[PDB]
């Protein structure tokens, strides 16, 4: 473990409550649906693969979209402009070499101009009040991985796969904090591969029992079982790659006995 | 922006130009950091400085007061502090700075730094020009344009980081990973610099930088830093200098100050002391 592993964990805990978006915001959006958000997020997974962006960059972009749509109404034909600016900002925050604006414009097939993307950027910054350093599922997972005894690369990839699936479906995952989804994703991955359970040292560090994780786990297990049928498939196709040891082809257990 | 009267340019830093200005309504003297926006939109340095400094509320970190997007420009409004550490050291280049003031300043910078680190932020440009002193005796970290939110554990980050004189050997020798230890190295150099009023390692290239480090601390090998001779930019033709005794290098320092400085300037990043552990060092026994 590195020097501040506990101080950082405690702080990320405090920040995730402040950076959380409104649980029911899509009900109040007159013109967009959860299904349109799923199509947007799944497209950004493709963009991430195409430009070789980090998984952290994708998780941040989604957090910016959810916080932006919690306070602004958006028409369907402008939803992809929101996502594009969000991805641009996430990349400038997190990446060593962000793609350029001109490239982000190109991947929308000239639906929007460069000027629109830079103005949407200003708007997103203003609406989010420049607070970009949000805790993600990814940041929690990588800390949780330091408690594996011993490390198992199949567990780590499967847990990343499940974490990333949760970005697609606002209902239900908007009702959970990132640290909870990461705990559910880690336990489910661990159980699928080795048959072991959410370990004692993580209960100690997180204050979460399996019991506290159970509602999210019930939700995540259903997401996992139904993933081959999902209208959106970019994440699944991505975790077929050998880089992620083909974990998206593994069979989910039939029950969790919880 | 109509509320501000520019008084004068006071410096540059990582990105943009910095001005002293006066709020016309409240009378408050501020510092304005200007970015012109004219191609990639808002620079990543600005996006990062702003998001991070909004979280970093601490008495030894400079306070961000406001962000104003005017017509083609971005202005960051900051508290103004009357002096930087570099100028303060130049004006004391003959008398010296009394060791208890050095101790206090170091203690305060370490508090600011431990805060950043416990809040997952690397500064990556600690040098005396970016350390600001107010009329009260407070010192504060500034210019977070090169800073970055880091993960647990870290990945690979930008290689071209930290002003040369303050840059850690693990960056210079090309390690794949670096972390909180790069900031502590910088502070070690600054600690030494307050004592002697001259930069500890003033190199004029990357190789010359290493050589200045080696001459003083001894040329690292596998005894002191396991893995060093395998590092990307390590060369078997590096000269082998012996390490110098600290009571010649920083004579005013007492026993405890020598021990602390040693621990901040360890070659191996895994041996180098953290900011929080440094605050507990016996050297800070009798700190004001
Ligand atoms: C932007 C914000 C973080 C900030 N707040 N106070 C700042 C400050 N105060 C020192 C100073 C004061 C007046 C002068 C001065 C006064 C008159 C004429 C010329 N210069 C110089 C430095 N300096 C700088 S940048 C120069 C140092 N590397 N940034 C500052
Ligand atoms: Br006025
Ligand atoms: Cl001296």
Coordinates of C-alpha atoms and ligand atoms in Angstrom, one line a residue:
Chain A
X1 CA 0.0 0.0 0.0
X2 CA 1.2 3.6 -0.8
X3 CA 1.6 6.4 1.7
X4 CA -1.8 8.0 1.7
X5 CA -4.0 5.1 0.8
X6 CA -6.3 5.5 3.8
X7 CA -6.5 9.3 3.8
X8 CA -7.3 9.3 0.1
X9 CA -10.0 6.5 0.6
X10 CA -11.7 8.5 3.4
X11 CA -11.6 11.8 1.3
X12 CA -13.0 10.0 -1.9
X13 CA -15.8 8.8 0.4
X14 CA -16.7 12.4 1.4
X15 CA -16.4 13.7 -2.2
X16 CA -18.6 11.0 -3.8
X17 CA -21.7 12.3 -1.8
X18 CA -21.1 15.8 -3.0
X19 CA -20.5 14.8 -6.7
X20 CA -23.6 12.6 -6.9
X21 CA -26.2 13.6 -9.6
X22 CA -30.0 13.7 -9.0
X23 CA -31.3 10.1 -8.8
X24 CA -34.5 10.8 -10.8
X25 CA -33.4 13.4 -13.3
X26 CA -34.5 11.6 -16.5
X27 CA -38.2 11.8 -15.4
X28 CA -37.9 15.6 -15.4
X29 CA -36.2 15.7 -18.9
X30 CA -39.0 16.5 -21.4
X31 CA -37.3 15.1 -24.5
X32 CA -34.6 12.5 -23.6
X33 CA -34.9 9.0 -22.1
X34 CA -32.7 6.5 -20.3
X35 CA -32.5 4.6 -23.6
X36 CA -31.0 7.7 -25.4
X37 CA -28.5 8.1 -22.5
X38 CA -27.5 4.4 -22.9
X39 CA -26.9 4.9 -26.6
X40 CA -24.8 8.0 -25.8
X41 CA -22.7 6.3 -23.2
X42 CA -22.1 3.2 -25.3
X43 CA -21.0 5.4 -28.2
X44 CA -18.4 7.1 -25.8
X45 CA -17.1 3.6 -24.9
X46 CA -16.4 3.2 -28.7
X47 CA -14.7 6.7 -28.7
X48 CA -12.6 5.6 -25.8
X49 CA -11.4 2.5 -27.7
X50 CA -10.9 4.3 -31.0
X51 CA -8.6 7.1 -29.4
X52 CA -7.1 4.7 -26.8
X53 CA -8.3 6.7 -23.8
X54 CA -8.1 5.4 -20.2
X55 CA -11.1 3.8 -18.5
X56 CA -10.9 6.6 -15.9
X57 CA -11.6 9.2 -18.7
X58 CA -14.8 7.4 -19.6
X59 CA -16.1 7.1 -16.0
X60 CA -15.5 10.9 -15.5
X61 CA -17.2 11.9 -18.7
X62 CA -20.3 10.0 -17.6
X63 CA -20.3 11.7 -14.2
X64 CA -20.1 15.1 -16.0
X65 CA -23.1 14.2 -18.3
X66 CA -25.2 13.0 -15.3
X67 CA -24.5 16.1 -13.3
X68 CA -25.0 18.3 -16.4
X69 CA -28.4 16.7 -17.2
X70 CA -29.4 16.9 -13.5
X71 CA -29.7 20.7 -13.9
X72 CA -30.2 21.4 -17.6
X73 CA -32.9 20.4 -20.1
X74 CA -31.5 19.1 -23.3
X75 CA -33.2 18.1 -26.6
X76 CA -32.3 14.8 -28.2
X77 CA -30.4 16.3 -31.1
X78 CA -28.1 18.2 -28.7
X79 CA -27.4 15.2 -26.3
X80 CA -24.4 14.1 -28.3
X81 CA -23.0 17.6 -28.1
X82 CA -23.2 17.4 -24.3
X83 CA -21.4 14.0 -24.4
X84 CA -18.7 15.2 -26.7
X85 CA -17.8 18.2 -24.6
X86 CA -17.9 16.1 -21.5
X87 CA -15.5 13.6 -23.1
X88 CA -13.2 16.5 -24.2
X89 CA -13.1 17.8 -20.6
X90 CA -12.5 14.4 -19.1
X91 CA -9.6 13.9 -21.5
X92 CA -8.0 17.2 -20.7
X93 CA -8.3 16.4 -17.0
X94 CA -7.1 12.8 -17.0
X95 CA -5.1 12.1 -20.2
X96 CA -1.4 12.9 -20.8
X97 CA -2.3 13.3 -24.6
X98 CA -5.9 14.2 -25.0
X99 CA -7.3 14.0 -28.6
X100 CA -7.9 17.4 -30.1
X101 CA -11.2 19.3 -30.6
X102 CA -11.0 18.8 -34.3
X103 CA -10.9 15.0 -33.8
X104 CA -13.9 15.1 -31.4
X105 CA -15.8 17.0 -34.1
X106 CA -14.8 14.4 -36.7
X107 CA -16.2 11.5 -34.6
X108 CA -19.6 13.1 -34.6
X109 CA -19.5 13.1 -38.4
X110 CA -19.8 16.9 -38.6
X111 CA -23.2 17.0 -36.8
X112 CA -21.6 19.9 -34.8
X113 CA -19.0 22.5 -35.5
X114 CA -15.9 23.2 -33.6
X115 CA -17.3 26.5 -32.3
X116 CA -20.4 24.5 -30.8
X117 CA -18.1 22.0 -29.0
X118 CA -16.0 24.8 -27.4
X119 CA -19.1 26.7 -26.3
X120 CA -20.6 23.6 -24.9
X121 CA -17.4 23.1 -23.1
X122 CA -17.7 26.5 -21.5
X123 CA -21.4 25.8 -20.6
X124 CA -20.6 22.4 -19.0
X125 CA -17.8 24.0 -16.9
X126 CA -20.1 26.7 -15.8
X127 CA -22.9 24.3 -14.9
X128 CA -20.6 22.0 -13.0
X129 CA -19.0 25.0 -11.4
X130 CA -15.5 23.7 -12.6
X131 CA -15.6 20.7 -10.2
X132 CA -14.1 18.0 -12.4
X133 CA -12.2 15.8 -10.0
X134 CA -15.0 13.4 -9.3
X135 CA -14.7 9.9 -7.6
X136 CA -15.4 7.1 -10.0
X137 CA -16.1 3.4 -9.7
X138 CA -12.7 2.9 -11.3
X139 CA -10.8 4.8 -8.5
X140 CA -12.5 2.7 -5.8
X141 CA -11.8 -0.6 -7.7
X142 CA -8.1 0.0 -8.0
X143 CA -7.9 0.6 -4.2
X144 CA -9.9 -2.5 -3.5
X145 CA -7.6 -4.5 -5.8
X146 CA -4.7 -3.8 -3.3
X147 CA -6.6 -6.2 -0.8
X148 CA -6.6 -9.3 -3.0
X149 CA -4.7 -12.1 -1.5
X150 CA -3.2 -12.8 -4.0
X151 CA -3.8 -10.7 -7.1
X152 CA -5.9 -12.5 -9.9
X153 CA -5.9 -10.7 -13.3
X154 CA -9.2 -12.5 -14.2
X155 CA -10.9 -11.0 -11.1
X156 CA -9.6 -7.5 -11.9
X157 CA -10.7 -7.4 -15.5
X158 CA -14.2 -8.9 -14.7
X159 CA -14.6 -6.3 -11.9
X160 CA -13.7 -3.6 -14.4
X161 CA -16.2 -5.0 -16.9
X162 CA -19.1 -5.0 -14.4
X163 CA -18.2 -1.6 -13.2
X164 CA -18.3 -0.3 -16.7
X165 CA -21.7 -2.0 -17.5
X166 CA -23.2 0.1 -14.7
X167 CA -22.5 3.3 -16.6
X168 CA -25.0 2.4 -19.4
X169 CA -28.1 2.0 -17.3
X170 CA -29.2 5.1 -15.3
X171 CA -32.0 3.1 -13.8
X172 CA -30.9 1.5 -11.6
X173 CA -27.3 2.6 -11.0
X174 CA -27.9 6.2 -10.4
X175 CA -29.3 5.1 -7.1
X176 CA -25.9 3.9 -5.9
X177 CA -22.7 5.6 -4.9
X178 CA -19.4 4.7 -6.8
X179 CA -17.9 3.0 -3.8
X180 CA -20.9 0.7 -3.5
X181 CA -20.9 -0.3 -7.2
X182 CA -17.2 -1.0 -7.0
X183 CA -17.8 -3.2 -3.9
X184 CA -20.6 -5.1 -5.7
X185 CA -18.5 -5.4 -8.9
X186 CA -15.5 -6.6 -7.0
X187 CA -17.5 -9.2 -5.0
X188 CA -19.3 -10.5 -8.1
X189 CA -16.1 -10.8 -10.1
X190 CA -14.3 -12.5 -7.2
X191 CA -17.2 -15.0 -6.7
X192 CA -17.6 -15.7 -10.5
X193 CA -13.8 -16.6 -10.9
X194 CA -12.6 -18.1 -7.5
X195 CA -15.8 -18.7 -5.5
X196 CA -14.4 -16.5 -2.7
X197 CA -16.4 -13.6 -1.1
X198 CA -15.9 -9.9 -0.3
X199 CA -13.0 -10.2 2.1
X200 CA -12.7 -9.4 5.7
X201 CA -10.0 -6.7 5.1
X202 CA -12.3 -4.7 2.8
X203 CA -15.2 -4.9 5.3
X204 CA -12.7 -3.3 7.7
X205 CA -11.6 -0.6 5.3
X206 CA -15.0 0.2 3.7
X207 CA -17.4 -0.3 6.6
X208 CA -19.6 -2.3 4.0
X209 CA -20.8 -5.8 4.8
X210 CA -22.1 -8.0 2.0
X211 CA -25.5 -7.2 3.4
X212 CA -25.0 -3.5 2.7
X213 CA -23.9 -4.3 -0.8
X214 CA -26.8 -6.7 -1.5
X215 CA -29.3 -4.5 -3.2
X216 CA -26.7 -3.2 -5.8
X217 CA -25.4 -6.8 -6.2
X218 CA -28.9 -8.0 -6.9
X219 CA -29.1 -5.3 -9.6
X220 CA -25.6 -6.0 -11.0
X221 CA -26.2 -9.7 -11.1
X222 CA -29.3 -9.1 -13.3
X223 CA -27.2 -6.7 -15.5
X224 CA -24.6 -9.4 -15.9
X225 CA -27.0 -12.2 -16.7
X226 CA -28.8 -10.1 -19.3
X227 CA -25.7 -8.5 -20.8
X228 CA -25.6 -10.7 -24.0
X229 CA -29.2 -9.4 -24.7
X230 CA -28.5 -5.7 -24.0
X231 CA -29.3 -3.3 -26.9
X232 CA -25.9 -1.7 -26.2
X233 CA -22.8 -4.0 -26.6
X234 CA -19.6 -1.9 -26.9
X235 CA -18.5 -2.7 -23.4
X236 CA -19.1 -6.4 -23.9
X237 CA -17.3 -6.4 -27.2
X238 CA -14.4 -4.6 -25.6
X239 CA -13.9 -7.0 -22.7
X240 CA -13.8 -9.9 -25.2
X241 CA -10.2 -8.7 -26.1
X242 CA -7.2 -10.6 -24.7
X243 CA -6.0 -7.4 -23.0
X244 CA -8.9 -8.0 -20.7
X245 CA -8.5 -11.8 -20.8
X246 CA -11.8 -12.3 -22.6
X247 CA -13.7 -12.0 -19.3
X248 CA -16.9 -10.9 -20.9
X249 CA -17.2 -14.4 -22.3
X250 CA -17.1 -16.0 -18.8
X251 CA -20.4 -17.4 -17.5
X252 CA -22.0 -15.5 -14.6
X253 CA -23.1 -17.7 -11.7
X254 CA -26.8 -18.6 -11.7
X255 CA -27.3 -17.4 -8.0
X256 CA -25.4 -15.6 -5.3
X257 CA -27.0 -17.3 -2.3
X258 CA -27.3 -13.9 -0.5
Chain B
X1 CA -14.1 42.4 -14.6
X2 CA -15.3 46.0 -14.5
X3 CA -14.8 45.7 -10.6
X4 CA -11.0 45.3 -11.0
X5 CA -8.4 47.9 -11.5
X6 CA -5.1 46.3 -12.8
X7 CA -2.1 47.8 -11.0
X8 CA 0.8 45.9 -12.7
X9 CA 2.2 42.6 -14.0
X10 CA 3.8 40.6 -11.2
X11 CA 4.9 37.4 -12.9
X12 CA 4.1 34.5 -15.2
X13 CA 4.1 30.9 -14.0
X14 CA 3.0 27.7 -15.6
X15 CA 0.5 29.2 -18.0
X16 CA -0.7 32.8 -18.5
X17 CA 0.2 36.2 -17.0
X18 CA -0.3 37.3 -13.4
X19 CA -1.4 40.8 -12.3
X20 CA -1.8 42.7 -9.0
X21 CA -5.2 44.3 -9.0
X22 CA -7.6 46.1 -6.6
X23 CA -11.3 45.3 -6.2
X24 CA -12.8 48.8 -6.6
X25 CA -15.9 48.1 -4.4
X26 CA -14.4 46.1 -1.5
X27 CA -10.8 47.5 -1.7
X28 CA -9.4 44.0 -1.6
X29 CA -5.9 43.6 -3.4
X30 CA -6.0 40.4 -5.5
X31 CA -3.9 38.5 -8.0
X32 CA -5.4 38.0 -11.5
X33 CA -4.1 35.1 -13.5
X34 CA -5.0 35.7 -17.2
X35 CA -5.3 33.1 -20.0
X36 CA -6.1 34.1 -23.6
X37 CA -8.3 31.6 -25.3
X38 CA -7.0 32.2 -28.9
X39 CA -7.8 26.9 -30.2
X40 CA -8.1 23.8 -28.0
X41 CA -10.5 25.7 -25.7
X42 CA -9.8 25.9 -22.0
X43 CA -6.2 24.6 -21.4
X44 CA -5.9 21.5 -19.3
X45 CA -3.5 23.4 -17.0
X46 CA -6.4 25.8 -16.1
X47 CA -9.0 23.1 -15.9
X48 CA -6.7 21.3 -13.5
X49 CA -5.6 24.2 -11.4
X50 CA -9.2 25.4 -10.9
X51 CA -10.9 22.0 -10.1
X52 CA -8.1 21.1 -7.7
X53 CA -7.8 24.4 -5.9
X54 CA -11.5 24.5 -5.3
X55 CA -11.1 21.3 -3.1
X56 CA -7.8 22.5 -1.5
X57 CA -9.0 24.7 1.3
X58 CA -6.0 25.1 3.7
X59 CA -4.2 27.9 5.4
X60 CA -0.9 27.0 3.6
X61 CA -2.4 26.8 0.1
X62 CA -3.1 29.9 -1.9
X63 CA -6.9 30.7 -2.0
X64 CA -8.8 30.8 -5.4
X65 CA -11.5 33.4 -5.0
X66 CA -13.2 33.5 -8.4
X67 CA -13.2 32.5 -12.0
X68 CA -14.4 35.0 -14.6
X69 CA -14.9 34.2 -18.3
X70 CA -14.8 37.6 -20.0
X71 CA -14.9 38.3 -23.8
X72 CA -12.2 35.9 -25.1
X73 CA -10.3 35.4 -21.8
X74 CA -10.3 33.5 -18.6
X75 CA -9.3 35.3 -15.4
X76 CA -8.6 33.4 -12.2
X77 CA -8.9 35.7 -9.1
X78 CA -6.6 34.7 -6.2
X79 CA -5.6 36.2 -2.9
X80 CA -2.5 38.3 -3.2
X81 CA 0.5 37.7 -1.1
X82 CA 3.1 40.5 -1.0
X83 CA 6.3 38.5 -1.6
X84 CA 7.7 35.1 -2.8
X85 CA 10.3 32.9 -1.1
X86 CA 12.9 33.6 -3.9
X87 CA 12.8 37.3 -3.4
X88 CA 12.9 36.9 0.3
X89 CA 16.0 34.7 0.1
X90 CA 17.8 37.2 -2.3
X91 CA 17.2 40.0 0.2
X92 CA 18.7 37.9 3.0
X93 CA 21.6 36.6 0.9
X94 CA 24.2 38.2 3.3
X95 CA 22.8 38.2 6.9
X96 CA 21.1 34.8 6.3
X97 CA 17.6 33.6 7.5
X98 CA 17.4 32.6 11.1
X99 CA 17.0 28.9 11.5
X100 CA 13.7 29.2 13.5
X101 CA 12.0 31.0 10.6
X102 CA 13.3 28.4 8.1
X103 CA 11.9 25.8 10.5
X104 CA 8.5 27.4 10.6
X105 CA 8.3 27.9 6.8
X106 CA 9.3 24.3 6.2
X107 CA 6.8 23.1 8.8
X108 CA 4.0 25.1 7.1
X109 CA 4.9 23.9 3.5
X110 CA 4.9 20.4 4.7
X111 CA 1.4 20.9 6.2
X112 CA 0.2 22.3 2.8
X113 CA 1.9 19.4 1.0
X114 CA 0.6 16.6 3.2
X115 CA -2.9 18.1 2.6
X116 CA -2.5 18.0 -1.2
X117 CA -1.2 14.4 -1.0
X118 CA -3.9 13.2 1.4
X119 CA -6.3 14.7 -1.1
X120 CA -4.7 12.8 -4.0
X121 CA -3.0 15.8 -5.6
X122 CA 0.6 16.1 -6.9
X123 CA 1.9 19.7 -7.2
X124 CA 4.9 18.9 -9.5
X125 CA 6.4 22.4 -9.6
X126 CA 7.5 23.2 -6.1
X127 CA 10.2 25.9 -6.3
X128 CA 10.8 29.2 -4.3
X129 CA 9.2 31.4 -7.0
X130 CA 5.9 29.5 -6.4
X131 CA 6.0 29.8 -2.6
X132 CA 4.3 33.0 -1.4
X133 CA 4.7 34.8 1.9
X134 CA 2.2 37.2 3.5
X135 CA 2.9 40.0 6.1
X136 CA 1.6 37.6 8.9
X137 CA 4.6 35.1 8.6
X138 CA 2.5 32.5 6.7
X139 CA 4.0 30.7 3.6
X140 CA 1.7 29.0 1.0
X141 CA 1.9 26.7 -2.0
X142 CA 1.0 28.3 -5.3
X143 CA 0.7 27.7 -9.0
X144 CA -1.1 24.4 -9.4
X145 CA -1.0 24.6 -13.3
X146 CA 1.3 21.5 -13.5
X147 CA -0.6 19.6 -10.7
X148 CA -2.6 16.4 -11.2
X149 CA -5.1 14.2 -9.4
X150 CA -3.4 10.9 -8.8
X151 CA -4.7 7.4 -8.3
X152 CA -4.2 4.5 -5.7
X153 CA -2.0 3.0 -7.0
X154 CA -0.6 5.5 -9.6
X155 CA -0.3 4.9 -13.4
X156 CA 2.3 6.5 -15.6
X157 CA 1.9 10.3 -15.8
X158 CA 3.5 13.1 -17.9
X159 CA 7.3 12.7 -18.1
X160 CA 8.3 16.4 -18.6
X161 CA 7.5 17.6 -15.1
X162 CA 9.1 19.8 -12.4
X163 CA 11.5 22.7 -13.0
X164 CA 15.0 21.3 -13.6
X165 CA 16.7 22.3 -10.4
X166 CA 14.0 20.9 -8.2
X167 CA 13.4 17.7 -10.3
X168 CA 13.8 14.3 -8.7
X169 CA 16.4 11.7 -9.9
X170 CA 13.7 9.1 -10.6
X171 CA 12.2 11.5 -13.3
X172 CA 15.7 12.3 -14.7
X173 CA 16.7 8.6 -15.0
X174 CA 13.3 7.9 -16.6
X175 CA 11.3 5.8 -14.2
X176 CA 7.9 4.6 -15.6
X177 CA 6.2 5.6 -12.4
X178 CA 6.5 8.5 -9.9
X179 CA 4.4 9.8 -7.1
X180 CA 4.3 11.9 -3.9
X181 CA 8.0 11.5 -3.5
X182 CA 8.8 13.9 -6.4
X183 CA 7.2 16.8 -4.4
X184 CA 9.2 15.9 -1.2
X185 CA 12.5 15.9 -3.3
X186 CA 11.6 19.4 -4.4
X187 CA 11.0 20.5 -0.8
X188 CA 14.3 19.0 0.2
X189 CA 16.1 21.2 -2.3
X190 CA 14.2 24.2 -1.1
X191 CA 15.0 23.4 2.5
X192 CA 18.7 23.4 1.7
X193 CA 18.3 26.5 -0.4
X194 CA 16.8 28.5 2.5
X195 CA 19.8 27.6 4.6
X196 CA 22.5 28.6 2.1
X197 CA 20.4 31.0 0.0
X198 CA 21.6 29.4 -3.1
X199 CA 20.1 26.7 -5.1
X200 CA 21.3 23.3 -4.1
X201 CA 21.5 21.7 -7.6
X202 CA 21.5 24.4 -10.4
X203 CA 22.0 22.2 -13.5
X204 CA 21.9 23.5 -17.2
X205 CA 20.7 20.2 -18.7
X206 CA 19.3 16.9 -17.7
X207 CA 22.7 15.2 -17.5
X208 CA 24.3 18.2 -15.8
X209 CA 21.5 18.1 -13.3
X210 CA 22.2 14.5 -12.4
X211 CA 25.9 15.3 -12.0
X212 CA 25.2 18.1 -9.6
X213 CA 23.0 15.8 -7.6
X214 CA 25.7 13.0 -7.7
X215 CA 28.6 15.3 -6.6
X216 CA 26.8 16.2 -3.4
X217 CA 24.9 13.1 -2.5
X218 CA 27.2 10.4 -4.0
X219 CA 26.6 8.6 -7.2
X220 CA 23.7 6.1 -6.7
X221 CA 24.3 2.4 -7.3
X222 CA 22.6 -0.9 -6.4
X223 CA 23.6 -0.6 -2.7
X224 CA 21.7 2.6 -2.1
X225 CA 19.0 2.3 -4.8
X226 CA 18.2 -1.2 -6.0
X227 CA 17.3 -1.2 -9.7
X228 CA 19.0 2.1 -10.5
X229 CA 21.7 0.7 -12.8
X230 CA 18.9 -0.8 -15.0
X231 CA 16.9 2.5 -15.4
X232 CA 16.3 3.8 -18.9
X233 CA 18.7 6.8 -18.8
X234 CA 21.3 5.3 -16.4
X235 CA 24.7 5.1 -18.0
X236 CA 27.6 2.9 -16.8
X237 CA 30.0 5.8 -17.7
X238 CA 28.5 8.1 -15.0
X239 CA 31.4 9.3 -12.8
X240 CA 31.4 7.8 -9.2
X241 CA 31.6 10.6 -6.7
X242 CA 31.5 10.0 -3.0
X243 CA 28.8 11.5 -0.9
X244 CA 29.6 14.8 1.0
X245 CA 29.1 15.4 4.7
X246 CA 26.0 17.6 5.3
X247 CA 27.7 19.8 7.9
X248 CA 29.8 21.2 5.0
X249 CA 26.9 21.3 2.6
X250 CA 24.4 23.0 5.0
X251 CA 26.6 24.1 8.0
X252 CA 23.9 26.0 10.0
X253 CA 21.8 22.9 10.3
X254 CA 21.6 21.1 13.6
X255 CA 21.7 17.3 14.0
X256 CA 17.9 17.0 13.5
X257 CA 17.8 19.2 10.5
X258 CA 20.6 17.2 8.8
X259 CA 18.6 14.0 9.5
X260 CA 15.4 15.4 8.1
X261 CA 17.1 16.8 5.0
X262 CA 18.7 13.4 4.4
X263 CA 15.4 11.7 4.6
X264 CA 13.8 14.2 2.1
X265 CA 16.7 13.7 -0.3
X266 CA 16.9 9.9 -0.4
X267 CA 17.7 8.5 -3.8
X268 CA 15.2 5.6 -3.7
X269 CA 11.6 7.1 -3.8
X270 CA 10.4 4.2 -1.5
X271 CA 12.9 5.4 1.3
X272 CA 12.1 9.1 0.9
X273 CA 10.1 10.4 3.8
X274 CA 6.4 11.5 3.3
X275 CA 5.1 15.0 4.1
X276 CA 3.0 13.7 7.0
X277 CA 5.9 11.6 8.5
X278 CA 8.2 14.7 8.2
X279 CA 5.8 16.8 10.3
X280 CA 6.5 14.3 13.2
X281 CA 10.3 14.5 12.8
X282 CA 12.1 15.7 16.1
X283 CA 13.4 18.7 14.1
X284 CA 9.9 20.2 14.5
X285 CA 10.1 19.9 18.3
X286 CA 10.4 23.5 19.0
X287 CA 8.6 24.9 16.0
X288 CA 7.0 28.4 16.5
Ligands
LIG1 C1 -1.6 34.3 -8.8 C2 -1.6 34.1 -7.3 C3 -1.2 32.6 -7.0 C4 -0.7 35.0 -6.6 N1 -1.0 35.6 -5.4 N2 0.1 36.4 -5.1 C5 1.0 36.3 -6.0 C6 2.3 36.9 -6.1 N3 2.9 37.7 -5.1 C7 4.3 37.9 -5.0 C8 4.7 39.2 -5.8 C9 4.1 40.4 -5.5 C10 4.4 41.5 -6.1 C11 5.4 41.6 -7.1 C12 5.7 42.8 -7.8 C13 5.3 44.1 -7.3 C14 5.6 45.2 -8.1 C15 6.2 45.0 -9.3 C16 6.5 43.8 -9.7 N4 6.3 42.7 -9.0 C17 6.0 40.4 -7.4 C18 5.7 39.2 -6.7 N5 3.1 36.5 -7.2 C19 2.6 35.7 -8.1 S1 3.6 35.3 -9.5 C20 5.2 36.0 -9.0 C21 5.9 35.0 -8.1 N6 6.6 33.9 -8.8 N7 1.3 35.1 -8.0 C22 0.6 35.4 -6.9
LIG2 BR1 -16.9 51.6 -9.0
LIG3 CL1 25.6 28.6 4.7

